[PDB]
Amino acid sequence: TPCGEGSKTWDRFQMRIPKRLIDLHSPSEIVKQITSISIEPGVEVEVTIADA
Amino acid sequence: VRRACYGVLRFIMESGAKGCEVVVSGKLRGQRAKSMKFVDGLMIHSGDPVNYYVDTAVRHVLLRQGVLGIKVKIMLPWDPTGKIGPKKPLPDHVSIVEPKDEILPTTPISEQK
Amino acid sequence: KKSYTTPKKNKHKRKKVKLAVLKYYKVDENGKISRLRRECPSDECGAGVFMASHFDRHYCGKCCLTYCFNK
RNA sequence: CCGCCGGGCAGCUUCCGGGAAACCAAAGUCUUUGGGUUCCGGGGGGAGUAUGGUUGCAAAGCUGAAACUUAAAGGAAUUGACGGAAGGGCACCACCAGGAGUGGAGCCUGCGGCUUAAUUUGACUCAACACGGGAAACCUCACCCGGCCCGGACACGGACAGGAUUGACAGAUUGAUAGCUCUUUCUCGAUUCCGUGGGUGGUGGUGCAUGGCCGUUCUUAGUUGGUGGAGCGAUUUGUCUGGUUAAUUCCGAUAACGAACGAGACUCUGGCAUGCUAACUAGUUACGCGACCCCCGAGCGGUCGGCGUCCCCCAACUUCUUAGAGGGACAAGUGGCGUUCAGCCACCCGAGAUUGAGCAAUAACAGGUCUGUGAUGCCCUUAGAUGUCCGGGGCUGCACGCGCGCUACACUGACUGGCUCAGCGUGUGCCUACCCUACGCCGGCAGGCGCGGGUAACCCGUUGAACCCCAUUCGUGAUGGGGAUCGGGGAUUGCAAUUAUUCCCCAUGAACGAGGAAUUCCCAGUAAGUGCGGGUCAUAAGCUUGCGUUGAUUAAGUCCCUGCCCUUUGUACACACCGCC
Numbered sequence: 001t002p003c004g005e006g007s008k009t010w011d012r013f014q015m016r017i018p019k020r021l022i023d024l025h026s027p028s029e030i031v032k033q034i035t036s037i038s039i040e041p042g043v044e045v046e047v048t049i050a051d052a
Numbered sequence: 053v054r055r056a057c058y059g060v061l062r063f064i065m066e067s068g069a070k071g072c073e074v075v076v077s078g079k080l081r082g083q084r085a086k087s088m089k090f091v092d093g094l095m096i097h098s099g100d101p102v103n104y105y106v107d108t109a110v111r112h113v114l115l116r117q118g119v120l121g122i123k124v125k126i127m128l129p130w131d132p133t134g135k136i137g138p139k140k141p142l143p144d145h146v147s148i149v150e151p152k153d154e155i156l157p158t159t160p161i162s163e164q165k
Numbered sequence: 166k167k168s169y170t171t172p173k174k175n176k177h178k179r180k181k182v183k184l185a186v187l188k189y190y191k192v193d194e195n196g197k198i199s200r201l202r203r204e205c206p207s208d209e210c211g212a213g214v215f216m217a218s219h220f221d222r223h224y225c226g227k228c229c230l231t232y233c234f235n236k
Numbered sequence: 237c238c239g240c241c242g243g244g245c246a247g248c249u250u251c252c253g254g255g256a257a258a259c260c261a262a263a264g265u266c267u268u269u270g271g272g273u274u275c276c277g278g279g280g281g282g283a284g285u286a287u288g289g290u291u292g293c294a295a296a297g298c299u300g301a302a303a304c305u306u307a308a309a310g311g312a313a314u315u316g317a318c319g320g321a322a323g324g325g326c327a328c329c330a331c332c333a334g335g336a337g338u339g340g341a342g343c344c345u346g347c348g349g350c351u352u353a354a355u356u357u358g359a360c361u362c363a364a365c366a367c368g369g370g371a372a373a374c375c376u377c378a379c380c381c382g383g384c385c386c387g388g389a390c391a392c393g394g395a396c397a398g399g400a401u402u403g404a405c406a407g408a409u410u411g412a413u414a415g416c417u418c419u420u421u422c423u424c425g426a427u428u429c430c431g432u433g434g435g436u437g438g439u440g441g442u443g444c445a446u447g448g449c450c451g452u453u454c455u456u457a458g459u460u461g462g463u464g465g466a467g468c469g470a471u472u473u474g475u476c477u478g479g480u481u482a483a484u485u486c487c488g489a490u491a492a493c494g495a496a497c498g499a500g501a502c503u504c505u506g507g508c509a510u511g512c513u514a515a516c517u518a519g520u521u522a523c524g525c526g527a528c529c530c531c532c533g534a535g536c537g538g539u540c541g542g543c544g545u546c547c548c549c550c551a552a553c554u555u556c557u558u559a560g561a562g563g564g565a566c567a568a569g570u571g572g573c574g575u576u577c578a579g580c581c582a583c584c585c586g587a588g589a590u591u592g593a594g595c596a597a598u599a600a601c602a603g604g605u606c607u608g609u610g611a612u613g614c615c616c617u618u619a620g621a622u623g624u625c626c627g628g629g630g631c632u633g634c635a636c637g638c639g640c641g642c643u644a645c646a647c648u649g650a651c652u653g654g655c656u657c658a659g660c661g662u663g664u665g666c667c668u669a670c671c672c673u674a675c676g677c678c679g680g681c682a683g684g685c686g687c688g689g690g691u692a693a694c695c696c697g698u699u700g701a702a703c704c705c706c707a708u709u710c711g712u713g714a715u716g717g718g719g720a721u722c723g724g725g726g727a728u729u730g731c732a733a734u735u736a737u738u739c740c741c742c743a744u745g746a747a748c749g750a751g752g753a754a755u756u757c758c759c760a761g762u763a764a765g766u767g768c769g770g771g772u773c774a775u776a777a778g779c780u781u782g783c784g785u786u787g788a789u790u791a792a793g794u795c796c797c798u799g800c801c802c803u804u805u806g807u808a809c810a811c812a813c814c815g816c817c
């Protein structure tokens with residue numbers, strides 16, 4: 001309900017967010033190949049350097 | 053209203069729609085509010101299916117008098133051929149591919165290749 | 166609702182006074198300007214800044230309108 | 237018994253033909269108008285009245301006006317819709333069988349009222365009442381007692397200079413260091429000011445001027461068309477006697493046949509998956525156990541039981557964790573029952589055909605919403621402004637009334653030791669100034685003061701909880717339950733808490749010993765208790781929405797009340813019985 005009234009019904013607004021992650025060992029080619037390809041839809045990609 | 057929304061509804065069907073509807077709620081040549089609804093073809097009105105099949109769209113319209121609502125609600129016939137139409141089947145709908153061949157009882161025989 | 170009676174004391178919207186202001190400028194014989202009265206301490210109001218006698222007030226008006234004291 | 241014949245009482249049936257229609261061998265032969273003849277009606281009432289005449293023993297009978305008023309009254313059939321009609325069917329917003337309560341007390345806050353300057357206000361059965369996310373000091377906030385401020389767009393007019401008054405540091409004041417105003421004047425300097433029209437807002441007005449969004453009739457089974465077939469035609473069948481079904485869902489009888497929306501299918505979810513793909517942002521698992529390792533403990537010692545760690549890892553793995561692909565469960569088998577169809581019931585293997593929501597048609601309704609909307613019609617109002625605010629105040633006020641909550645009434649319990657089991661979340665560093673918190677001291681405690689991790693599956697955090705569970709008091713005393721109302725301190729948030737902010741520490745220490753008339757809630761991991769998150773948050777919840785946790789009794793059917801679906805029927809109702817009269 002906008003405003004007050006009517007028998008009290010609510011909605012149950014949901015958004016999921018699954019995280020995958022993949023470890024690897026490479027140079028600055030294989031990272032910059034594999035990351036820039038396979039992009040496109042609503043997908044965020046992080047790239048950690050090493051360990052921390 | 054009349055001639056216009058037909059002009060729309062005509063079009064959207066002729067374009068290539070499974071079905072469609074238009075609603076023009078609001079005051080309409082009278083101090084009282086009417087609600088008009090001109091409909092054509094097929095339309096599913098429940099389920100998840102609705103979510104990725106109908107193309108709902110509300111728009112107001114602010115006129116020299118007051119305010120009407122448009123509601124266009126088109127049904128997409130990408131069920132036939134999206135290219136791979138998402139799911140394609142409305143889950144109700146099953147397509148049984150037909151016997152095709154299944155010829156010959158006959159006497160036995162053999163062959164070699 | 167109510168309809169506003171108003172205690173009969175219709176408060177004054179006031180003019181900031183008319184005033185030509187700059188006639189009182191002592192030109193003693195040839196061209197030279199300086200009178201004396203009370204002064205303000207501000208920077209944009211540099212030394213020339215000038216004061217008064219009212220029913221009390223006195224004010225200084227020269228960091229454009231920024232800075233009137235309390236006398 | 238079987239025929240025929242006349243004239244009698246009657247029946248069915250039909251596209252004669254009639255018939256407004258219902259119907260009618262006759263109401264048939266009627267614009268294709270008249271076989272004979274009798275009576276008799278000309279909108280409704282007034283009125284079968286008045287008056288006159290007559291008959292009668294009289295009730296009364298017979299004959300029988302008008303003024304006036306009146307727009308329909310009426311008839312036949314249609315859908316409605318309601319029956320204190322009838323069959324069928326169904327809902328725990330229904331009942332049964334109960335428990336839990338609720339309705340009683342105190343307290344909370346919701347409204348009503350009174351009171352009050354003000355207690356702004358929307359919301360009025362149900363589908364208004366901890367609802368407007370409505371837990372409000374200040375803001376909120378609109379509202380009152382004031383009081384400031386202008387943020388008067390825009391244009392159109394008016395104002396070159398003896399500078400249009402842009403903008404003014406000490407006092408009179410004022411609340412204010414509001415030049416907002418009463419002299420003084422010292423600068424920006426083409427702004428300014430004053431008209432006119434016109435805006436611009438307004439948590440002003442109107443939700444019967446509207447958009448959207450919502451609520452609901454109503455998670456109830458319903459709704460619709462193409463072609464047929466019926467009706468001159470509105471309409472009607474298809475759309476249904478019965479069995480079935482959560483469900484016009486199905487099969488079948490079947491002037492219908494095959495279709496469409498709703499239901500169903502779907503999505504999310506919830507549970508079987510030593511089956512797969514894997515995972516230092518899970519777990520890890522158990523190792524291998526290589527250890528530290530202290531007798532942590534067993535044991536003379538070998539050896540072992542075990543938390544912790546020393547880990548790391550170039551173990552190994554997914555046994556639980558996680559989340560991807562999968563599978564499966566599908567009335568699937570067998571035995572009843574069943575028109576032996578549609579299915580129903582029981583049992584087998586096993587999750588037995590139903591784990592729980594979201595989505596939800598046609599069509600509605602002055603439901604609610606203009607105060608969620610820079611959605612807004614028109615209206616008001618428009619500078620002294622209902623434009624925006626500062627300060628305060630109110631929204632909290634109190635002889636009464638109701639509404640949702642909590643806590644109790646105690647000993648299956650009360651307070652006194654102790655042991656010890658999560659889940660869904662949540663978190664900083666965020667759109668304008670702001671968290672989550674681990675571990676040190678200090679203090680009783682609120683807390684305080686130290687310091688640490690944390691875009692988080694890492695840090696909080698083996699989330700170390702309450703009931704619960706276990707260890708002692710107490711003895712049925714309004715008692716140690718209960719725990720209101722006040723006395724006094726101390727912290728914290730906040731610029732500020734007076735109008736106890738919130739918290740702590742003291743201190744007082746109430747009614748209630750199971751609730752009068754009523755009435756909602758629901759069947760399985762269900763009611764109840766029980767904390768805990770989230771939402772609300774500077775401060776903060778007795779609010780909701782989720783989450784486990786502990787976990788019952790009982791129905792497993794019926795329509796007995798209330799209310800819903802179809803069918804048949806009646807209906808002077810169609811503002812639909814809360815009607816009409």
Ligand SMILES: [Mg+2]
Pocket residue numbers: 263
């Ligand atoms: Mg006749």
Ligand SMILES: [Mg+2]
Pocket residue numbers: 266269
């Ligand atoms: Mg005739």
Ligand SMILES: [Mg+2]
Pocket residue numbers: none
């Ligand atoms: Mg007449």
